[PDB]
Amino acid sequence: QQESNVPYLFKVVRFKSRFRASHGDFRILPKFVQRSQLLRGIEKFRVSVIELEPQSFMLPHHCDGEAIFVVVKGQGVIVIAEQDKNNSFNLQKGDVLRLHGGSTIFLLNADANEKFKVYVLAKSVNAPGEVQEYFSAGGQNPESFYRAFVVDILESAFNVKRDKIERLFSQQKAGAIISASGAQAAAKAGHASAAGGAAAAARVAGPFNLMKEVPEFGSAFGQFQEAAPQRHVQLRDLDAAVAFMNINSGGMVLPYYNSRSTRVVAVVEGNARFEMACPHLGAAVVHYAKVRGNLNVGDVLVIPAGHPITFVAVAGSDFRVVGFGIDAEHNKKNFLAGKQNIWRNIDREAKELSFDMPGAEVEEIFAKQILSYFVAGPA
Ligand SMILES: O=C1CC[C@@H](C(=O)O)N1
Ligand SMILES: [Mg+2]
């Protein structure tokens, strides 16, 4: 596994900036099928990262993809402008927001020191996997799409003399993410509901955050929390989930597999060693290829459904990731070792036949791990 050969691994440097901005960046990973047809089952999805430096503003624009924004660091204000409604939310770490495709948005990082980072999942509605940005704001740089219209049409549309309206669209030359003044920050944020306050909603609801809830799976060595479409209606159309997994330093998540959901995992903190069992790269008779590697901040690992996987935190940091789940509804985590695992639900005689060893002996071995989900890693 020279890593560029592991098709499920997408190193951080593979994310491509969509523009050159002074106060931040917006970078997107290539289509998942760029180097392998093994990922054709998730071809319509793209993941990206939005970074805003302190005291910055990202210009109004919309995308042709249905998105889910997850704040991984800092605080920022998102304002959404529809044809007949305005919504603004003050987002914080852990917030999850479903953004309808075609929503014109702008972002503001009002903090004086901390960067605002968002991990984004988008699903195409035009050609599979193609998601583009449409800058309504802008002029020469970023180019505003209004410049695609002839001057007589702009004049008639805006009821403004052509030279004046043309001029409006050529004043901006600073780029897509620029400096915001302290006043401007106060002004643009301020109608923004701060933990959320969706409205007593219909179309665009506010963010939700699960970081204060009890983990679905947890132990002294790690935690797993997930926003499922079963619980959050805003995620049903995309049939996506947003998972948060943290493995404490020196810990590991016990081998497990997802029953039907493919996960696009992005590292937000730390480092980890991963090992996955893949029958495709390996395998008439089936053979499981040992797909392994190391993950660093910003890297992405796609975990296909049904594939056994384990992550081992390395060095002196907890290892934290945000995972987007595709085909999420009805997905179940199946652990392969630990007190709570699938073998708890397999009878003794079946274990004996499974491993050609006395059933009580197989059970004795499977009961040695008294902990579940996350345990101390090798050392
Ligand atoms: O689909 C996407 C890509 C970028 C993000 C946005 O509109 O900022 N939505
Ligand atoms: Mg930049």
Numbering used by the authors: 5 to 287, 297 to 392
Paste lines from the article.
Among the abundant seed proteins, globulins are considered a major family of seed proteome. 7S globulins are also called vicilins and perform various functions, including the role in sucrose binding, desiccation, defense against microbes and oxidative stress. Structurally, vicilins are trimeric, formed predominantly by non-covalent interactions. The vicilin, SM80.1, from S. melongena was purified and the crystal structure determined using ab initio phasing method.
Crystal structure showed presence of acetate and pyroglutamate molecules bound in structurally quasi-equivalent cavities in each of the two domains of SM80.1. We were able to visualize a highly flexible loop region, which is otherwise missing or found disordered in other homologous vicilin structures. Further, examination of the region around the asymmetric unit in crystal structure revealed that the protein exists as a homotrimer. Each monomer also shows formation of core region by pair of β-barrels and helices protruding outward from each core to interact with the neighboring monomers, resulting in the formation of a trimer. Magnesium (Mg) ion is also present in the structure and exists at the interface of the monomers. Pyroglutamate is present in the largely hydrophobic core of N-terminal β-barrel domain. Phe30, His65, Cys67, Tyr73 and Ile109 are the residues in the close proximity and interacting with pyroglutamate in the N-terminal core region.
